[PDB]
Design a protein around this ligand. Structure first.
Ligand SMILES: CCCCCCCCCCCCCCCCCC(=O)OC[C@H](COP(=O)([O-])OCC[N+](C)(C)C)OC(=O)CCCCCCCCCCCCCCCCC
Ligand code: SF4
Ligand code: SF4
Ligand code: SF4
Lengths: 176, 155, 70, 96, 55, 318, 298
């Protein structure tokens, strides 16, 4: 089906042309605009008071990455090396090494924030939910260097936002 | 003494400079529409005291927002050049930060800082509107911690 | 809401308020309470010059009438 | 919190005056919000930690910190691996 | 919503329509952000009877 | 004490202009459902101060291909003329009671175009050059209607003395007699003052910043101050002309209340228009003026010259 | 006389790196290609890729795609109209609609987890389910948006300044428009009787009714009426998809092209291998070629 959008039939009776002349002479349609915006002013605004109040978000939010650890506290990461293999920007660099215990985890988990694109594929890639990416978005900076996150930086951030992301995946893993 | 007087004078200039900057968003890519989104009534930069001003001879801070290519490279620098002092550039998004998703392609310079002296790096792909709003807030905090008149006093 | 713009325009009303009040009161104050006797035509001007000379003090605005004649 | 206000401004904050040994009466940042309360403030969950305390862990940061960029306790990247090619140690004492 | 009937009348008359019926903002009508856990379905070929991938 | 009165007139207007940026920013934002400046001080009250002293502390870069003497004279003429616009206003009792104030009003307003022409030429850039040329072209097209409207409007007043307008409107607003001219005069004031839809002079979207495309920092405020000062004065001029007020000699306070309250209403509807209409175009800008405005102004002028004769209602020249 | 649209000031590798990224890795490129129509791009990629794989997504997946596809159509048409009004002058319809634009942007966040680059439409369906109650909020949004369209038309449609800057401007005849390779609204504005969603209904678009807004002049004004009518017809799709959202799975029941469920990942060995090789090697698409075409809002 379809419908026309500009087939207009201006009736040429003496009545109708009076409105058309009234429209042109007295700026009726322009006055419609004035009363239109006036009604908008007489309405409330919707400007949220940042940072005293921020935008509404969702448990599935993708933000800043943070490596987590088990309830025991050992790092979930086992260097399966899936995340960099799917990482569409190759922002994840990592090299595994033997460990003293034999639970040979990685000596390197460096995610370049200025190369990464926050698809969240790393979360889906990780079979042990080691690399998740938290709800934080305030991690701005002034020098390009501090965005080259390293294994220590992710571990510290994971220990920081651990209170938040733990509940987020708690309320979202059923969907995943 | 003179230190106290110059401290007040520096603060007086400081307060306006951190509350009257007029950004010029050099709209490049999907990062740019987000900056128009934080022009929406939801965030409304202008409530802070900043207005989207063209003619970059009027603007104070200029925002690269999106990927930057070699074709865009020389003109973008010139925008920075005749941009009057004080001038600050904020890196919007991963692509402007460090090339981002196209960091390896043949046509985009990896990172915008290779062309201009980036002041604030804002991560994101795209950075959510209020994340940039946070970055602008960081700009004023950094603007608050300057010693222009103080340095001249010891100069 | 829109009660937040009234502080802006109320100051505005005060700004345009001042020039009207000043020129009204200075005219009143300088010209002994009365307004500035305007002379759009030469008749009104030579009316004033008569007043300035007739006041005995060389100001037109000083008005002095029936107390003089005898 | 005020449910009568529209979505967004319905719950909000005024920040503290002392944050980790830093004056913050005039300045305002969004990052001093602790993680467990960051969940509730962004409407990611409409029930505050006062009624649903976050699960306690030995490693969870006891003191939340704001952004540290531009400050002496900044972050600085550094290679976390170990140097692999080591030089031939030059022996000492004799000659021929 | 907050807004008194006086300037509600001003919005309604100037706009030529009633705006209290529907507003561009949100209110209590929004589903609360603690929705119960789901029970997402299983695949059509999730049966453990004849399910050979040769089909 | 004539001097202190002068500063009592120019100083408040400059502070009024500064605060005009704040209210316009907030009101325009409110149409767009925004909030406008409310962080810098209570309800953005110190935003004009913040904007003013930030730009002053920004270097006034002169373009390489600029005549510095030519670059500087234009703001001086622009700002001084705008402040001089108020000296014959019938504010309680007019400051400069020029018997031909309306002619003095028109001559100074028409002399403002030299700032537009000189700024464009001194900048010496194609974008600024054609921006200025069309700017004056829009400018010079409309004041002929301004003169015709005033001649028809002032015809039933009695003379060109601005103070006489008060006694003419002693009973009813003068808009009722010439409301076709009132909208005629009002629209032409936007074109002179260069607000949307008549913003093609500046054209923020499509002419970058018009003649202010380069003009920065120090003397840029002068055009901005002169522009916004004209907004009040043109609205104030319209307020006295058509929306007259009663003036008790023993209480000039009262008529100031009426005059002031009207002139913010007239300025408010200015940016109210800006927040509702698309920007015009150069050809429509001329076509609207020369094809549908000039003929109507002529006929209405013809109607208003003969009207006092056919009704024996000619006004006294005094 | 002549205008040269010198473009390339944004030319990235795009297709060049796609030769080096796997199908899954290449998916986020389309989100960034026509960046204002987020899902409509990856809709084309998933339709293209699943066509080669000879695998059709479950009906539940299809209905989510079209719902977000038309929601994305609301995204872009608001962009196209408001941004145009910015430069023509009047800038308040910009902000008025952008308040709404956040609401569906918020909806994007509720499902995918990101604001713009959702990366939701994957080959074989969609990545995740809608959160519980998500359809309710978009239903509340759908009710109020018809009013917001009325704000645009009342603001602009009858305004003389809007019309005269737009009517009888940039008109193109049907033959040249088709010969120029134009598409979508560009042809429809000139009265050309064509629409991909109708003539070649991909996905669920056959099981839905909507009126294509064919213009009758070909000038800019005709398209503007066509676009705002496309808004209303898009709102028709939201309602029809809302009342007819079927149950079922989110992705195809073929782990060789669809990563297994996280629960099945950690209990079933076949899932681990299938998840492993999919995120490192990726599914192998059979050789061949295909030009799959969908009607983006552009
Ligand atoms: C005995 C009676 C004697 C008198 C009788 C007089 C005739 C009856 C009254 C006629 C109407 C009044 C005179 C004409 C007015 C219109 C002139 C004209 O050209 O109109 C058509 C014109 C042109 O319309 P157009 O361009 O669409 O069509 C004109 C005709 N063609 C196409 C052939 C060119 O309208 C405009 O110019 C529109 C407005 C442009 C400016 C934008 C801002 C408008 C703001 C409006 C709101 C604010 C109003 C404030 C009013 C004052 C407040 C103090
Ligand atoms: S979201 Fe994860 S997988 Fe995707 S680019 Fe970023 S680090 Fe790599
Ligand atoms: S973080 Fe997860 S996906 Fe990445 S290497 Fe470690 S275990 Fe593998
Ligand atoms: S950083 Fe991401 S969102 Fe920003 S321009 Fe690059 S790809 Fe687009």
């Amino acid at each position: 089906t379809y419908k026309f959008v500009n087939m207009r039939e201006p009736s040429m009776d003496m009545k109708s042309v009076t409105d058309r002349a009234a429209q042109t002479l007295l700026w009726t349609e322009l006055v419609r605009g004035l009363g239109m915006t006036l009604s908008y002013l007489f309405r409330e605004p919707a400007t949220i008071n940042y940072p005293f109040e921020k935008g509404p978000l969702s448990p599935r939010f993708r933000g800043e990455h943070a490596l987590r650890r088990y309830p025991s506290g050992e790092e979930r990461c086992i260097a399966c090396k899936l995340c960099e293999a799917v990482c569409p920007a190759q922002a994840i660099t990592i090299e595994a090494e033997p460990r003293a215990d034999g639970s040979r985890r990685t000596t390197r988990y460096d995610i370049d924030m200025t190369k990464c694109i926050y698809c969240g594929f790393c979360q889906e890639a990780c079979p042990v939910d080691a690399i998740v990416e938290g709800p934080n978005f305030e991690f701005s900076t002034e020098t390009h260097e501090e965005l080259l996150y390293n294994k220590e930086k992710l571990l510290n951030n994971g220990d920081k936002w651990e209170a938040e992301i733990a509940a987020n995946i708690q309320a979202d893993y059923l969907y995943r | 003494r003179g230190e106290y007087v110059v401290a007040k004078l520096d603060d007086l200039v400081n307060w306006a400079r951190r509350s009257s900057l007029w950004p010029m968003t050099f709209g490049l890519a999907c990062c740019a529409v987000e900056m128009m989104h934080m022009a929406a009534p939801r965030y409304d930069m202008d409530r802070f005291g900043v207005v989207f001003r063209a003619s970059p001879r009027q603007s104070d801070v200029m925002i690269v927002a999106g990927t930057l290519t070699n074709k865009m490279a020389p003109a973008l620098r010139k925008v920075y050049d005749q941009m009057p002092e004080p001038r600050y550039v904020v890196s919007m998004g991963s692509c402007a930060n460090g090339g981002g998703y196209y960091h390896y392609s043949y046509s985009v310079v990896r990172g915008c800082d290779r062309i201009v002296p980036v002041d604030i790096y804002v991560p994101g792909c795209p950075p959510t509107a209020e994340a940039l709003l946070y970055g602008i807030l960081q700009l004023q905090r950094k603007i608050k911690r300057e010693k222009r008149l103080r340095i001249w006093y010891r100069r | 809401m829109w009660f937040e713009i009234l502080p802006g325009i109320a100051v505005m009303a005060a700004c345009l308020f001042i020039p009207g009040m000043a020129t009204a009161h200075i005219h009143k104050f300088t010209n002994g309470g009365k307004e500035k006797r305007v002379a759009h035509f030469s008749y009104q001007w030579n009316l004033m010059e008569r007043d300035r000379c007739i006041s005995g003090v060389n100001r037109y605005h000083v008005t002095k009438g029936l107390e003089n004649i005898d | 919190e005020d449910n009568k206000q529209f979505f967004g401004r319905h719950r909000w904050v005024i920040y503290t005056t002392e944050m980790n040994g830093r004056d913050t009466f005039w300045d305002v940042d969004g990052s001093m919000v602790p993680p467990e309360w960051h969940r509730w403030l962004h409407c990611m969950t409409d029930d505050p930690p006062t009624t649903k305390p976050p699960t306690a862990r030995k490693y969870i940061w006891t003191n939340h910190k704001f952004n540290v960029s531009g400050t002496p306790q900044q972050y600085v990247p550094y290679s976390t691996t170990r140097k692999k090619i080591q030089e031939w140690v030059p022996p000492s004492t004799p000659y021929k | 919503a907050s807004a008194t009937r006086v300037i509600q009348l001003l919005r309604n008359w100037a706009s030529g329509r009633d705006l209290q019926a529907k507003l561009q903002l949100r209110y209590q009508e929004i589903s609360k952000r603690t929705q119960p856990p789901p029970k997402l379905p299983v695949g059509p070929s999730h049966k453990l009877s004849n399910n050979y991938y040769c089909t | 004490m004539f001097m202190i009165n002068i500063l009592s007139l120019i100083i408040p207007i400059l502070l009024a202009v500064a605060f005009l940026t704040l209210v316009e920013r907030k009101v325009l934002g409110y149409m767009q459902l925004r909030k406008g400046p409310n962080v810098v001080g209570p309800y953005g009250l110190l935003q004009p101060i913040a904007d003013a002293l930030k730009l002053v502390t920004k270097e006034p870069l002169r373009p390489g291909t600029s005549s510095i003497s030519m670059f500087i004279i234009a703001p001086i003429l622009g700002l001084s003329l705008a402040l001089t616009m108020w000296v014959p206003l019938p504010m309680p009792y007019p400051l400069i009671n020029m018997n031909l104030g309306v002619l003095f009003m028109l001559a100074m307003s028409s002399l403002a175009v030299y700032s537009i022409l000189w700024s464009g030429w001194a900048s010496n850039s194609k974008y600024a050059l054609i921006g200025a040329l069309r700017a004056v072209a829009q400018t010079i097209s409309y004041e002929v209607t301004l003169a015709i409207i005033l001649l028809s409007v002032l015809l039933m007043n009695g003379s060109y003395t601005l103070s006489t307008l008060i006694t003419t409107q002693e009973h009813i607003w003068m808009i009722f007699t010439s409301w076709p001219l009132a909208m005629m005069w009002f629209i032409s004031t936007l074109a002179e003052t260069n607000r949307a839809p008549f913003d093609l002079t500046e054209g923020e979207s499509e002419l970058v910043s018009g003649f202010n495309v380069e003009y920065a920092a120090g003397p840029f405020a002068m055009f901005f101050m002169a522009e916004y000062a004209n907004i009040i004065m043109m609205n104030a001029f319209t307020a006295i002309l058509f929306l007259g007020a009663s003036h008790d000699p023993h209480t000039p306070e009262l008529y100031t209340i009426n005059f002031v309250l009207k002139t913010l209403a007239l300025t408010i509807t200015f940016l109210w228009i800006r927040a509702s209409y698309p920007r015009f175009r150069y050809d429509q800008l001329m076509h609207l003026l020369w094809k549908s405005f000039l003929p109507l102004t002529l006929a209405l002028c013809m109607w208003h010259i003969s009207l006092p004769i056919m009704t024996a209602s000619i006004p006294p020249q005094s | 006389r002549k205008c040269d649209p010198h473009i390339g000031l944004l030319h990235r590798g795009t297709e060049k790196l796609i030769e080096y990224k796997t199908y899954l890795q290449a998916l986020p490129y389309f989100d960034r290609l026509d960046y204002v129509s987020m899902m409509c791009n990856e809709q084309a990629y998933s339709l293209a890729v699943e066509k080669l794989l000879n695998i059709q997504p479950p009906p539940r997946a299809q209905w989510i795609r079209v719902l977000f596809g038309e929601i994305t159509r609301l995204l872009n048409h608001i962009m196209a109209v408001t941004t145009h009004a910015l430069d023509i002058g009047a800038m308040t319809p910009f902000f008025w609609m952008f308040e709404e634009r956040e609401k569906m942007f918020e909806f994007y966040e509720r499902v995918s987890g990101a604001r713009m680059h959702a990366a939701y439409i994957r080959p074989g369906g969609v990545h995740q389910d809608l959160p519980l109650g998500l359809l309710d909020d978009i239903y509340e949004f759908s009710k109020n948006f018809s009013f917001r369209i009325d704000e645009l038309e009342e603001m602009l449609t009858n305004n003389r300044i809007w019309r005269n800057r737009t009517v009888d401007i940039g008109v193109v005849t049907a033959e040249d428009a088709l010969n120029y390779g134009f598409s979508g609204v560009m042809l429809r504005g000139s009265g050309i009787q064509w629409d991909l969603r109708k003539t070649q209904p991909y996905d669920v678009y056959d099981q839905v009714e909507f009126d294509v807004p064919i213009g009758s002049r070909g000038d800019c004004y005709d398209r503007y009426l066509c676009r705002v009518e496309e808004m209303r017809q898009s709102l028709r799709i939201i309602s029809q998809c809302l009342n007819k959202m079927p149950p079922g799975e989110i992705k195809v029941d073929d782990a060789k092209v669809s990563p297994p469920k996280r629960a099945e990942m950690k209990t079933s060995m076949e899932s681990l291998i299938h998840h492993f090789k999919l995120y490192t090697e990726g599914y192998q698409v059979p050789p061949g070629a295909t030009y799959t075409a969908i009607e983006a809002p552009k």
